[PDB]
Amino acid sequence: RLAELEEFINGPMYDAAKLLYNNVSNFGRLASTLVHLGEYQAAVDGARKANSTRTWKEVCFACVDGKEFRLAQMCGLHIVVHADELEELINYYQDRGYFEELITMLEAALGLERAHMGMFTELAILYSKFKPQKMREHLELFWSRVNIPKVLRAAEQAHLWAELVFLYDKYEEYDNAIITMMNHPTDAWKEGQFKDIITKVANVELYYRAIQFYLEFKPLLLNDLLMVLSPRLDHTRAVNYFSKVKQLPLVKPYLRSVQNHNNKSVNESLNNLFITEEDYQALRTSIDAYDNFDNISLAQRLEKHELIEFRRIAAYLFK
């Protein structure tokens, strides 16, 4: 020990070289041997002085092997910042099965001034398959600083529907956000945002596919939803469906809201309602303001009605 301590340090083996490399100050191997000597905490000092990447990898990895984590962490925050290195560092903490610590480190890295995309993208991914509850609040803050396509394929695989919509939304892949809110309603579906995304949708067919969904599982919301679909909705096609599905009394609010298009199936459909609900004043106005309908059919149908207000209308229709 002191044998070479006062000899090499007098004038111009892991424990001997430890001193040798120490005076020449080749921290590259000073740190390397310190590890190879189980003197971890100090080896992280040599790696600091050595200020080398390939060097922190030797120390960090071994520091891991020795299951020294608070060390392997601060000794790992010097590597994550290096995109070209981020992967091997993760793939290493993975096979050693230390997924818990790997995600505890990245937790801090995020703070680092040199924190990049590859980090946020990788934390999300991990979070999905190891801490789903966090997966949300994470995208909530760093959805902009992450490779979206990869994070999606990662929630798709992790059935995190609520989040999937979030991103599909941000990534402006609206058709997908809707399709998703529609197959996994409990999770994803939210009344308000459905009425905001649906619009952006590209493939209009989804409207008719949504109408059906809302109609079969959410009746009270079908009208307010129809109101937003109006501009691009093929009303004749819409009314036909509701009619075949004998649901026209439910979409009344919508029918009135559209009738002003003097659409036929609309008037005919709308008029049948005023009739079954003995609303003759409303019927009068309808056959007065909008004329696209078969008056003789109506006329004939009404001339047989038991209510005088209607029989009078029939007469008016025939004239």
Which amino acid makes up residue 224?
D
Structure determined via: X-ray
Angle between helices 148-156 and 161-170 (to 10 degrees): 160
Q: How far is CA 43 from CA 72, 105, 301, in A?
A: 11, 19, 97
Q: How far is CA 233 from CA 6, 229, 246, in A?
A: 92, 6, 19
Tokens describing residue 31: 């740190």
Classify residue 299 by burial, with Cβ atoms within 10 Å: 0-12, 13-18, 19+: middle
> Any residues with CB less than 8 A from the CB of 268 and at least 6 apart, and which?
293, 294
* Contact present, 125 and 99 (Cβ < 8 Å): no
Residues in the chain whose C lies over 2.5 Å from the next residue's N (breaks after): 12
**Cα–Cα distance for residue pair 192/172, rounded to 1 Å:** 17
Domain ranges of the chain: 1-319
* Contact present, 90 and 121 (Cβ < 8 Å): no
Angle between helices 117-128 and 148-156 (to 10 degrees): 10
Tokens describing residue 169: 């939304």
Which amino acid makes up residue 303?
E
Q: Give the resolution value in Å.
A: 2.6
> Any residues with CB less than 8 A from the CB of 277 and at least 6 apart, and which?
none
Q: How far is CA 247 from CA 35, 243, 244, 255, in A?
A: 77, 6, 8, 12
Q: Which of 121, 127, 130, 123 is nearest to 150 (CA)?
A: 121
Q: 1-319: which CATH architecture?
A: Alpha Horseshoe (1.25)
* Contact present, 120 and 142 (Cβ < 8 Å): yes
**Cα–Cα distance for residue pair 164/176, rounded to 1 Å:** 9
Which position has the token pair 């000794």? Answer: 75
**Cα–Cα distance for residue pair 134/155, rounded to 1 Å:** 12
Q: Which of 56, 5, 3, 2 is nearest to 27 (CA)?
A: 56
Q: Which of 165, 159, 166, 118 is nearest to 143 (CA)?
A: 166
* Secondary structure (H, E, C), the chain: CHHHHCCCCCCCCCCCHHHHHHHCCCHHHHHHHHHCCCCHHHHHHHHHHHCCHHHHHHHHHHHHHCCCHHHHHHCCCCCCCCHHHHHHHHHHHHHCCCHHHHHHHHHHHCCCCCCCHHHHHHHHHHHHCCCHHHHHHHHHHHCCCCCHHHHHHHHHCCCCHHHHHHHHHHCCCHHHHHHHHHHCCCCCCCHHHHHHHHHHCCCCHHHHHHHHHHHHHCHHHHHHHHHHHHHHCCHHHHHHHHHHCCCCCCCHHHHHHHHCCCCHHHHHHHHHHHHHCCCHHHHHHHHHHCCCCCHHHHHHHHCCCCCHHHHHHHHHHHC
